Amino acid sequence: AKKVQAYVKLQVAAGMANPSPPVGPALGQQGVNIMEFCKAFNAKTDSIEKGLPIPVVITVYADRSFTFVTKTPPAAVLLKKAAGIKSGSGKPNKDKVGKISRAQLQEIAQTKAADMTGADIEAMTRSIEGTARSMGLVVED
Amino acid sequence: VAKLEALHERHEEVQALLGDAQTIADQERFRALSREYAQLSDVSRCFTDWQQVQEDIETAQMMLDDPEMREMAQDELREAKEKSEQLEQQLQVDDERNAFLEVRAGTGGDEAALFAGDLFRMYSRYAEARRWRVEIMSASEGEHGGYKEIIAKISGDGVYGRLKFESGGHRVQRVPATESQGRIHTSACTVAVMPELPDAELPDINPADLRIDTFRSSGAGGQHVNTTDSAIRITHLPTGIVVECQDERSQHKNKAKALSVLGARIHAAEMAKRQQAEASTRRNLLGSGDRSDRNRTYNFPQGRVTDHRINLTLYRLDEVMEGKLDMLIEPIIQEHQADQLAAL
Amino acid sequence: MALNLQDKQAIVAEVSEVAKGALSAVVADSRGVTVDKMTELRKAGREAGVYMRVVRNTLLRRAVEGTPFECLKDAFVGPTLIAYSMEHPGAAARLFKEFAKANAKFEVKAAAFEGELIPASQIDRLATLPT
Amino acid sequence: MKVRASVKKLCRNCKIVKRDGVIRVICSAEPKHKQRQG
RNA sequence: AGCCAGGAUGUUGGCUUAGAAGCAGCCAUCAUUUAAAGAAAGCGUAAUAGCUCACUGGUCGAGUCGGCCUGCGCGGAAGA
């Protein structure tokens, strides 16, 4: 009976342990048991794979039951790790990333379609393409 | 290494402190707490990695005396050296500016002087082994021993970051090149290293806090002097210095002399301040070398050169006199960085 | 949005929607959130397509000028904004019925639900559309 | 209020009033934009 | 101009992965949904949270808005 009255988004670097240091005060925001959150957290690390910081949806209720909904891994870490590149951008006149195949972008887009919605699936591939543009990531077929 | 034991319990302690709901209230604590973690976690990982590798060695060390397990030993021993070498650079990570090298003869008179000659050589040779530079500005001779007192200017990169640990008296035991007999003596040479700090200057006045007054000049004259504000006083609020002047008739000619004297004042007092502070620093850095305020002993008859700050002795002196002290000073830096972690 | 070049540009797109459409539905989300349409337009793109482009330009001198030729009965639709929910693929589809279910959950005001044209009638709720 | 010779709008909530010839600036967002004369 | 809604999704987007999550010295000015929304104008937090504006729909319904050339004024203006 208490849906949108307490909302917080968490889940940081999944290759770690009990979230007391980096997450602690954010959990103390409602008085949530950090360990109970850790039971959901560790069950979510083992859910897919560890080593990918993900953003989760947390909604703690009046009766201490919180709904955890994980999301898709962000393209920043995915394109960086899966393509095995470490360049990034910020210095557009000096530094940029090399090319990456469109199917590679599409395979990652396949994943995110399933999670992140819309109307056009090719536009979802274009969404990570937009990510690609600012980060310096060059897309090629 | 015992100092590194304090290091790992400090890591444990991060688990307790970082995680408390009310500790975030103190922006002071929280920032400084996080500062520690940056150094803490990396070097703790460094040390815990070391823990595994180390214990591995002793269990497979004296095990059944088989040379096949020695091949397993062979593998990890090579790893251990290269591994801790990487770990050493992490710990060695500020001041790296140029520095003045002062080495002056202590107790021993002429032999004291002559030994400094040889000592000055090793640092200059050490500099050439690293291609910094070297240029002297003052030199005094002992009539047959080279340098009685010499102030050098070492220009380079990371100079003070290496030569910082040379502050003290150096004791040498050797057959002196001045003894008619073939006796053995003890001589002292004090070595001082101070960082080359910038000597910038202030705008000398900054006319926005200068309480300027004027009044009827006190002294001889006539009707003129009775009704002429021809005397100026400059009061400097940050220092609280007062300069009175009444020489010329014109206030501006008088204000000219006033500003001139006030110039000298603040400029000269600030230099005297730095001068006094530098000698303060220097006498608590040099130490009156009287055979007993040493840090390292260069013993020639036995070919040994030991250091007393970490109680380490080496039986390879010839290369040290040929300026290859990199080896020596590395363990000193390592020991101090170990105590640098347990300083907070 | 400069002038009638672009204003009527929306009207040209509007006429194309009437060219293949027959039936319509009523809806008024004056509290409508992104999350609302992030599902309802997603459900459109999953059901039969993005043909249902929710047009809330119900002004009597705007949207009505867009189609005074077809579906003349839309005159009194002017005030209390109603989006012409056209049904192109499959005349009389289940598009009205799916927002009717949303009518129970969250559609606080259903802008006087009566059933749009092609019975050529009123008020009686059209739930008899071939699904 | 700040008394000056030049009074400009500081935000989107500033308002120029001309009470008794004195141009005065009121701002019901942040009571620090309040000005006078000019 | 008021009065009702939205003002978001990938994205704590790559500071030097501890941090400025549209927000300091960091880049580029992406892509969807469309009646609409800037990877941004401020406040606040280590940061979030939170509240607004652009822009966009219904409403009442008519002139309104910002510059330019100039006449005459107002403040800027306090002495024995």
Curated annotation (Swiss-Prot), chain A:
Record-linked Gene3D superfamilies: Ribosomal protein L11, C-terminal domain, Ribosomal protein L11/L12, N-terminal domain
GO function term, MF aspect, one: structural constituent of ribosome
InterPro entries: Ribosomal_uL11, Ribosomal_uL11_bac-typ, Ribosomal_uL11_C, Ribosomal_uL11_C_sf, Ribosomal_uL11_CS, Ribosomal_uL11_N, Ribosomal_uL11_N_sf
PROSITE patterns documented for this protein: RIBOSOMAL_L11 (PS00359)
GO CC terms in record: cytosolic large ribosomal subunit
The keyword RNA-binding appears for this protein: yes
A Pfam family assignment: Ribosomal_L11_N
Keyword Transport: no
UniProt modification remark: One or more lysine residues are methylated.
Entry keywords, A to Z: Methylation, Ribonucleoprotein, Ribosomal protein, RNA-binding, rRNA-binding
Domain of life according to the entry: Bacteria
Gene Ontology biological-process entries: translation
CDD domains the record matches: Ribosomal_L11 (cd00349)
Quaternary structure annotation from Swiss-Prot or TrEMBL: Part of the ribosomal stalk of the 50S ribosomal subunit. Interacts with L10 and the large rRNA to form the base of the stalk. L10 forms an elongated spine to which L12 dimers bind in a sequential fashion forming a multimeric L10(L12)X complex.
Family: Belongs to the universal ribosomal protein uL11 family.
UniProt cross-references to PANTHER family, sorted A to Z: 60S RIBOSOMAL PROTEIN L12, LARGE RIBOSOMAL SUBUNIT PROTEIN UL11M
Protein name: Large ribosomal subunit protein uL11
Taxonomic source organism: Escherichia coli O45:K1 (strain S88 / ExPEC)
Upper lineage: Bacteria, Pseudomonadati, Pseudomonadota, Gammaproteobacteria, Enterobacterales
Swiss-Prot record, chain B:
Keyword field: Cytoplasm, Methylation, Protein biosynthesis
N5-methylglutamine: residues bearing it: Q223
Residues annotated as signal peptide: none
Native source organism of the sequence: Escherichia coli O45:K1 (strain S88 / ExPEC)
GO MF annotations in UniProt: translation release factor activity, codon specific
Protein name (record): Peptide chain release factor 1
Lineage, uppermost ranks: Bacteria, Pseudomonadati, Pseudomonadota, Gammaproteobacteria, Enterobacterales
Top-level lineage group: Bacteria
Family: Belongs to the prokaryotic/mitochondrial release factor family.
HAMAP family (alphabetical): Rel_fac_1 (MF_00093)
Chain residue ranges for the region called Disordered: 272-301
SUPFAM superfamilies: Release factor (SSF75620)
PTM comment: Methylated by PrmC. Methylation increases the termination efficiency of RF1.
Function: Peptide chain release factor 1 directs the termination of translation in response to the peptide chain termination codons UAG and UAA.
InterPro entries: PCRF, Pep_chain_release_fac_I, Pep_chain_release_fac_I_sf, Prokaryotic/Mito_RF, RF-1
Location relative to the cell: Cytoplasm
Swiss-Prot record, chain C:
Record bears the keyword NAD: no
Coiled coil: none
Sequence similarity: Belongs to the universal ribosomal protein uL10 family.
Gene that encodes the chain: rplJ
Gene Ontology molecular function, alphabetical: large ribosomal subunit rRNA binding; structural constituent of ribosome
Protein name per Swiss-Prot or TrEMBL: Large ribosomal subunit protein uL10
Superkingdom in the source lineage: Bacteria
Keyword Ligase: no
Function, in words: Forms part of the ribosomal stalk, playing a central role in the interaction of the ribosome with GTP-bound translation factors.
Quaternary structure, from the entry: Part of the ribosomal stalk of the 50S ribosomal subunit. The N-terminus interacts with L11 and the large rRNA to form the base of the stalk. The C-terminus forms an elongated spine to which L12 dimers bind in a sequential fashion forming a multimeric L10(L12)X complex.
Keywords: Acetylation, Ribonucleoprotein, Ribosomal protein, RNA-binding, rRNA-binding
GO biological process, one term: translation
GO cellular component terms, A-Z: large ribosomal subunit
Source organism of the structure: Escherichia coli O45:K1 (strain S88 / ExPEC)
Residue positions, PTM N6-acetyllysine: K37, K105
Curated annotation (Swiss-Prot), chain D:
GO molecular function: rRNA binding; structural constituent of ribosome
SUPFAM superfamilies: Ribosomal protein L36
GO biological process, one term: cytoplasmic translation
Protein keywords: Ribonucleoprotein, Ribosomal protein, RNA-binding, rRNA-binding
InterPro entries, A to Z: Ribosomal_bL36 (IPR000473), Ribosomal_bL36_sp (IPR035977)
PANTHER family tied to this protein: 50S RIBOSOMAL PROTEIN L36, CHLOROPLASTIC, LARGE RIBOSOMAL SUBUNIT PROTEIN BL36C
Protein's UniProt name: Large ribosomal subunit protein bL36A
Organism of provenance: Escherichia coli (strain K12)
Gene name in the database record: rpmJ
